[PDB]
Write a protein that binds this ligand. Sequence first.
Ligand SMILES: [Ca+2]
Ligand SMILES: [Ca+2]
Ligand SMILES: [Ca+2]
Ligand SMILES: [Cl-]
Ligand SMILES: [Cl-]
Ligand SMILES: [Mg+2]
Ligand SMILES: [Mg+2]
Ligand SMILES: [Mg+2]
Ligand SMILES: [Mg+2]
Ligand SMILES: [Mg+2]
Ligand SMILES: [Mg+2]
Ligand SMILES: [Mg+2]
Ligand SMILES: [Mg+2]
Ligand SMILES: [Mg+2]
Ligand SMILES: [Mg+2]
Ligand SMILES: [Mg+2]
Ligand SMILES: [Mg+2]
Ligand SMILES: [Mg+2]
Ligand SMILES: [Mg+2]
Ligand SMILES: [Mg+2]
Ligand SMILES: [Mg+2]
Ligand SMILES: [Mg+2]
Ligand code: NA
Length: 121
Amino acid sequence: FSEEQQAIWQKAEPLFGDEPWWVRDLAKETGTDEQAMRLTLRQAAQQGIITAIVKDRYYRNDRIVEFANMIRDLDQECGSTCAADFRDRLGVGRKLAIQILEYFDRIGFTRRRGNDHLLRD
RNA sequence: GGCGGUUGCAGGUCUGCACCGCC
Ligand SMILES: [Ca+2]
Ligand SMILES: [Ca+2]
Ligand SMILES: [Ca+2]
Ligand SMILES: [Cl-]
Ligand SMILES: [Cl-]
Ligand SMILES: [Mg+2]
Ligand SMILES: [Mg+2]
Ligand SMILES: [Mg+2]
Ligand SMILES: [Mg+2]
Ligand SMILES: [Mg+2]
Ligand SMILES: [Mg+2]
Ligand SMILES: [Mg+2]
Ligand SMILES: [Mg+2]
Ligand SMILES: [Mg+2]
Ligand SMILES: [Mg+2]
Ligand SMILES: [Mg+2]
Ligand SMILES: [Mg+2]
Ligand SMILES: [Mg+2]
Ligand SMILES: [Mg+2]
Ligand SMILES: [Mg+2]
Ligand SMILES: [Mg+2]
Ligand SMILES: [Mg+2]
Ligand code: NA
């Protein structure tokens, strides 16, 4: 973190609860230039503090670990995790549910086969 | 009706519907 990036992070940081954040919303909320916020969160993600599931949409890393354990729970009730079941269980729209699931697919946590996300590890 | 929107909801996925913007 530069000095400008450290001042906007102390701003952005308390706002990271259980919900994901778009860069642009973080920026509107803390009175910071959108692009300046974009670079600060990218460095926050290089540190290992927050993870972008899609470009500019971030969760705290411990939130990700909880989602990974929800996939383990559903895998064991159903035999696998599909979009519809995950978004039912999360209580969120299907679009965020698929963003999260496709995140895990591309880190190799799960693999997609048809509608299912199968535990890979 | 056309073109759009890091909008929402759905269905595996780039479309439908809704809402907004410009015509
Ligand atoms: Ca894990
Ligand atoms: Ca299933
Ligand atoms: Ca499995
Ligand atoms: Cl959430
Ligand atoms: Cl990623
Ligand atoms: Mg939502
Ligand atoms: Mg629903
Ligand atoms: Mg909603
Ligand atoms: Mg999606
Ligand atoms: Mg497939
Ligand atoms: Mg019309
Ligand atoms: Mg459009
Ligand atoms: Mg937005
Ligand atoms: Mg767009
Ligand atoms: Mg949309
Ligand atoms: Mg919009
Ligand atoms: Mg379909
Ligand atoms: Mg496809
Ligand atoms: Mg397309
Ligand atoms: Mg429509
Ligand atoms: Mg109307
Ligand atoms: Mg109107
Ligand atoms: Na939990």
